[PDB]
Design a protein around this ligand. Structure first.
Ligand SMILES: Cc1cc2nc3c(=O)[nH]c(=O)nc-3n(C[C@H](O)[C@H](O)[C@H](O)COP(=O)(O)O)c2cc1C
Ligand SMILES: Cc1cc2nc3c(=O)[nH]c(=O)nc-3n(C[C@H](O)[C@H](O)[C@H](O)COP(=O)(O)O)c2cc1C
Ligand SMILES: O=C(O)c1cc2ccccc2[nH]1
Ligand SMILES: O=C(O)c1cc2ccccc2[nH]1
Ligand SMILES: [K+]
Ligand SMILES: [K+]
Ligand SMILES: [K+]
Ligand SMILES: [K+]
Ligand SMILES: [Mn+2]
Ligand SMILES: [Mn+2]
Lengths: 497, 497
């Protein structure tokens, strides 16, 4: 077989064909070694590692693919792994990937198709045949509080009334032979659904966690598409094809037919267990910072022959927690702004900001027609974005005019540093939900869950009135066209590189 | 021949020997073409251009060297041009260059030596033999308001009482056959001295402007060394050698003996003329933004045979206005902090910030012993730096702990973005002098000359108390030493780059 965006096994073959895979066939320790190799790959934009000989792999569980959504070294195919999640050419731009991810937002859903079996049913282990402590679950960072089996799988939970089935990524680690613990926090959909089941009060939440799902599905899992929208039908619409699902054996949830590994069980409405600490997306671990997390019971494991577990070795730049969390939040923010009649053309979370900022490119012709001011406009943008779940992870919004490419972190930093007067050109938001994972929130001086957000206006004053009133002091803008071309045409004749 | 740091002609030969020069021997137009080549070099870190055939060069005036203090492409000798200004090895680190620039601050000055002649006397033109409009003065940016002869020369002015002779860079453009106009603004020393002569009220200010001075001298010219300190004796101390000066022909000022070009005349205490606009260090020009500037009268020109004028094509990253203005301000700030008993180890102006920020590395052992708080410490640092001339150009200070290399813009941006909560972890300074050249100041929403400054505390809370309480989620810190070395030793055997 099936296409790469619809079948993780084919996606791995796509990375090989692209010369973007290293297959490691000698024994590799899941205790730190796999994740350290993966971490070095992410910090250097190297090829993705496939660990085919993982110390502790028993009865087909499991191989590991690291860095599934990280960057390539070349600028021409920088985002090629992400393009391979979506059937795009490997040279696709970030604008094209985010447009593809947003495309289903004004299309009818294409609901999934139930099939009677699939590769995920090739093997099974009941409640008497597996032990999660006996699998080659990675220790990802040396101070982690557990072996994080779940960094790139899909949790599947459904509202009590059946009308909404949510697919999302949220971390989880092994607690004992048949339980995980993990992070289930507001305002995430897995938490919203959990709350529904707690208020009903009758049973634990039927649950599955599928690893190595269709790559188009894992991308939507990482995107804050709207409340109540079933990710399966959004992915159907975006790919133009109904996704094939099979029923779980022990519950009535449906998992992708080609999933590599499937856990079936329950998310408790009452129990907790120790969770964390973990080396997280902003680049830190606080050793010993353990909290009580949600508790998941595993009743059954099903899996493909020669199953492969995807792993994110997350932390400092650049991994899936940057390329997918930041970019996909920015995409949804862009749409959100446009639906609120704000003149936003583009949005991106700069990697330099540890994806805590989003830069918002403004159509300044439209801004001018609004006849507004910085104070007013900053307030409107911040109220729309920071009061919505799509803004949760983002603590600074940078407004820039049409001359800035928000996908170029150098140009966002230039505009921020030169066009936004500290204090006067900014509005602080202290009564909005904060992202506690950012160290300055959860480990900082103020409330972990509230405030610490800002809108930084890097629009210049005439951008609101009569139009841009500068030219850049750069090669592009400070020399006429004929001269620039002469210089470029003579560059290597004259002796330059 | 004489040594490169003491003789600009030798410095040009040093750049050739270093394979860091392109000699262009075919005709090049000083109307935009020389500066566009220079601009492209600065934006790509290419070799410095030497224009030996400048259209309009008459009777030896003049050749142009562009990009004299810009960056090399290699990381190993990134700062090699700056090292060649100072007799340092071309692999010198920025810490070593700034230490060299600060070295004379606790040494006795070595006053200059007067010699009876030098190469700068090889040719002369009186008041009847030159016309500044007839020289091949560059047009640097297409919207500049004049031909900026002066981007990398040394103004020489002396206090009325003779006790202080100041060397500094400040821009100037041709006004007519025998005058320049330029920027003389507070709190710069050329302005402080000008004010002294205005208050005396008796005569215009005796003046010289020397181009292609000793490279060690042009570096101190770009540094805010303290009020009242004669740059010549500071350069003497830093180089361990008394600088050789010759007297001007028409006044009693002294100019470096090996200066390429010397203008002699007066800076008026009464007259002004149109000045600017200019494509400036933060990357902008505002066309048509002309103001009245100080007016300089030129009475005599002296020059070397085959004289070379240095030119900065300034604007967007990376040129002399970044490498020298930012770095040398940061060096003086570091010293200033240490002299005020603040536990600052290192300072640098990140290029990413368009050298509007300085990152201050804190010795957190010392900070802990202070038993202070973020609010208190931010206030003390900002009061010391933003009330001093060394802080003039800097609008944001970022405080970081010992784990951050402030010379690495990626690590400063990481620390800023993840450790400083917007608003709560910052203190705004509105009653301090502002730098009007930053667009958000002079072309912004508030007072051009006041406020818009901030101290951003990216120290974490335990850095003030008990010590760092995290490990980075990176390859360096999240894996033991033996594992890391195993990974590095097996990297290319396994198939990575
Ligand atoms: C590698 C990776 C790790 C993530 N880890 C978490 C996590 O631990 N908790 C969490 O709530 N979201 C995590 N996310 C982000 C969510 O998937 C994202 O916020 C998504 O919008 C959640 O889906 P929902 O909108 O259906 O709630 C992770 C995403 C990726 C790519
Ligand atoms: C390429 C270049 C251009 C500069 N242009 C100006 C200018 O136009 N005006 C100015 O006051 N300073 C300018 N500077 C900065 C000053 O040289 C610097 O602030 C120095 O500290 C001034 O000397 P002083 O401390 O003796 O006043 C320039 C520096 C460089 C490297
Ligand atoms: O628990 C965590 O590491 C975590 C929570 C979370 C929420 C949103 C985005 C990223 C996330 N990571
Ligand atoms: O007039 C200017 O371009 C200019 C003034 C100034 C003052 C300090 C540093 C850089 C500077 N550039
Ligand atoms: K989702
Ligand atoms: K602004
Ligand atoms: K100086
Ligand atoms: K802080
Ligand atoms: Mn959802
Ligand atoms: Mn001075």
């Amino acid at each position: 077989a099936q296409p790469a965006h619809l079948c993780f096994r084919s996606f791995v073959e796509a990375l090989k064909v692209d010369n973007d895979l290293v297959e490691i066939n000698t024994p590799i320790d899941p205790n730190l070694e796999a994740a350290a190799i993966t971490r070095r790959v992410c910090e250097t934009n190297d090829k993705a590692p496939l660990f085919n000989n993982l110390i502790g792999m028993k009865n087909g569980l499991f191989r590991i693919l690291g860095a599934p959504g990280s960057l390539r070294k070349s600028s021409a195919d920088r985002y090629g792994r992400l393009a391979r999640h979506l059937a795009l050419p490997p040279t696709a731009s970030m604008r094209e990937i985010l447009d593809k991810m947003l495309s289903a937002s004004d299309m009818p859903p294409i609901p999934p198709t139930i099939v009677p079996t699939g590769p995920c049913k090739e093997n099974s282990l009941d409640d008497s045949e597996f032990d999660l402590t006996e699998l080659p679950v990675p220790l990802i960072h040396k101070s982690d509080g557990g072996k994080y089996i779940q960094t790139y799988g899909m949790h599947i939970v459904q509202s009590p009334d059946g009308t909404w089935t949510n697919w999302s990524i949220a971390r989880a680690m092994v607690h004992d032979k048949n339980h995980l613990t993990g992070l289930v926090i507001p305002p995430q959909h897995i938490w919203q659904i959990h709350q529904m089941w707690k208020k009903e009060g009758r049973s634990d939440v039927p649950w599955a966690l599928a690893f190595g799902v269709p790559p188009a599905a894992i991308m939507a899992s990482s995107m804050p598409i709207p409340d109540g929208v079933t990710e399966a039908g959004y992915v159907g619409a975006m790919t133009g094809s109904s996704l094939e699902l099979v029923k779980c054996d022990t519950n009535d949830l449906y998992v992708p037919a080609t999933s590599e590994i499937v856990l079936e069980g329950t998310l408790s409405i009452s129990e907790t267990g120790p969770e964390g600490p973990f080396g997280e997306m902003h680049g830190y671990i606080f050793p010993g910072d353990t909290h009580l997390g949600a508790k998941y019971k595993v009743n059954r494991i099903t899996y493909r022959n020669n199953a492969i577990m995807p792993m994110s070795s997350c932390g400092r730049l650049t991994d899936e927690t940057h390329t997918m969390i930041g970019s996909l939040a920015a995409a949804e923010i862009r749409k959100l702004c446009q639906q609120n009649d704000l003149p936003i053309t583009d949005a991106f979370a700069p990697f330099e900001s540890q994806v805590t900022w989003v830069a918002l490119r403004v159509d300044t012709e439209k801004l001018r027609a609004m006849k507004t001011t910085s104070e007013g406009f900053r307030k409107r943008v911040g109220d729309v974005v920071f009061n919505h779940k799509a803004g949760y992870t983002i603590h600074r919004l940078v407004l820039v005019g049409d001359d800035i490419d928000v996908y170029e972190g150098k140009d966002v930093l230039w505009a921020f540093s030169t066009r936004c007067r500290p204090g006067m050109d900014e509005t602080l938001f202290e009564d909005v939900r904060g992202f506690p994972l950012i160290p300055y929130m959860g480990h900082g001086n103020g409330p972990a869950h509230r405030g610490g957000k800002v809108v930084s206006d890097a629009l210049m004053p005439t951008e609101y009135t009569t139009g841009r009133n500068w030219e850049a002091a750069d090669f592009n803008q400070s020399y006429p066209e004929d001269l620039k071309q002469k210089v470029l045409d003579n560059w290597t004749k004259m002796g330059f590189s």
